[model samples]
Target: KVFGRCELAAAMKRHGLDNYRGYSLGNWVCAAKFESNFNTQATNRNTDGSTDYGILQINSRWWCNDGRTPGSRNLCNIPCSALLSSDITASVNCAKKIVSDANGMNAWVAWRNRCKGTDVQAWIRGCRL
Candidate 1:
């Protein structure tokens, strides 16, 4: 489904950087905060002066069309960007896929636990609800 800006913003705020917890919320917020100030409209120019796009700060050069040309398809076709837009869940899922595909959720839990001053993984490995 297509999400407008208000929908996207609401979705984002529901589980966005500031609200994520126990899951990849912390890591997602940390990454986005470090990367783009968590701005959904954020864009940056590469050394070659091409555009990178969206809240996740996905680059068109790598994930999008032609792997070199600038295109909206590079940013999940703009509409998909809204689907993948401001929501931290979307960002967390993306980060997990890109960074920890084999054990993404597990690895994210470990990281969150460490950062939260806990080691739930140490005692609860393979435990899930």
Candidate 2:
């Protein structure tokens, strides 16, 4: 499912993304905009031969196991296919796990490049925070 920007923002906030760690829901929303444009089934292949799956574009090499990425850690212990659902539960949970790491939200290059120093208010402008 393709989520409206504010729709995703409210949903992520409901799922505990509001100021999770040091990153705000708007930060997450901004990253999602750049990474997958709020499309649940969004995906991408990396030059390193790993794949990024679903919203937040969790990586296969260390998060979800695609059974193809070399030495995949599958730290989320979830199937990559699970990330593709419009439900967003599994995807959001996995993203939380990723953010718990040392890299935090910077784990997403899209976030680092597009959202790090930028004001993310537009991503959650109309959402009820």
Candidate 3:
């Protein structure tokens, strides 16, 4: 199975996150499907900012910056659309780290659960794609 970001998502589908021990591949795909419909360029409007882009819906603005780049563009505070022009890999990697650190599906489910609530204070409230 393939487990990559952007163009790598397809490969991840086939490889099924085999390298990700103690993680849920089904949850990853489920989260990916629910987050951006598997769109590598997916973006959502937030009161403060947006979330995710590409297949993994990685937040490029949070991770992509001059000091952070090895030889890439500085994309801090940039919108997902503009950030996409900088680096797609970085975006996915950031999101993947979040997912991995959260112990897989937990993060996605939490986001979905929090968003499903009636509270609007949550950035992900009523978030769809």
Candidate 4:
């Protein structure tokens, strides 16, 4: 599913992405924009053979079980396929786990490069939050 900008913001907030690791809702929204463009089925494969999945782009190596990725840690204990669906429960909960680890939201390269120190409010500006 592809979400409208503000619509995605509201969804993330409802799912508890707001300030989960001292990063604001806007921060998560911004990361989502650059990471997945609000598309649930988005995916990207890494050079090391692992793949990123979903709106949060949880990685197959550390988060999900893709069977194709040999080093998968399955920290989220979910199939990587689950991350590609519109059911965001897997993505959101796994994201919470990721933020709990070292570097927080910096775990995502996109978050670090694009949303980390920027005016993330622009990611959520137009919506009645």
Candidate number achieving the greatest lDDT relative to the actual structure: 2
TM-score of each: 0.42, 0.96, 0.47, 0.96
Deviation (Å) of 111 in candidate 1: 13
Query: What TM-score would candidate 2 get against the native?
Result: 0.96
Model 3 lDDT per residue over 53-83, tens place: 5555554345344233234333344444543
Model 1 scores worst on lDDT over the 10 consecutive residues at 120-129
True-structure lDDT of candidate 2: 0.90
Per-residue lDDT tens digits for candidate 4, residues 1-129, read 998899888888889888887889998888888999999999999999999999989999989999999868999989999998887878999999999998898898999998888888888887988
Task: List runs of model 2 lying over 4 Å from the truth.
Answer: none
lDDT of each: 0.43, 0.90, 0.45, 0.89
> RMSD in angstroms, candidate 1?
9.7
Model 4 residue runs over 4 Å out of place are: none
Q: RMSD per prediction, one decimal?
A: 9.7, 1.0, 10.2, 0.9
**TM accuracy, model 1:** 0.42
Q: Where is the poorest 10-residue window by lDDT in model 3?
A: 120-129
**Which candidate would rank higher by lDDT, 2 or 3?**
2
lDDT by residue for model 2 (69-105), tens: 9989999999999999989999999998899998888
Give me the runs in candidate 1 sitting further than 4 Å from their true place.
1-23, 66-96, 100-129
Residue 105's lDDT in candidate 1: 34
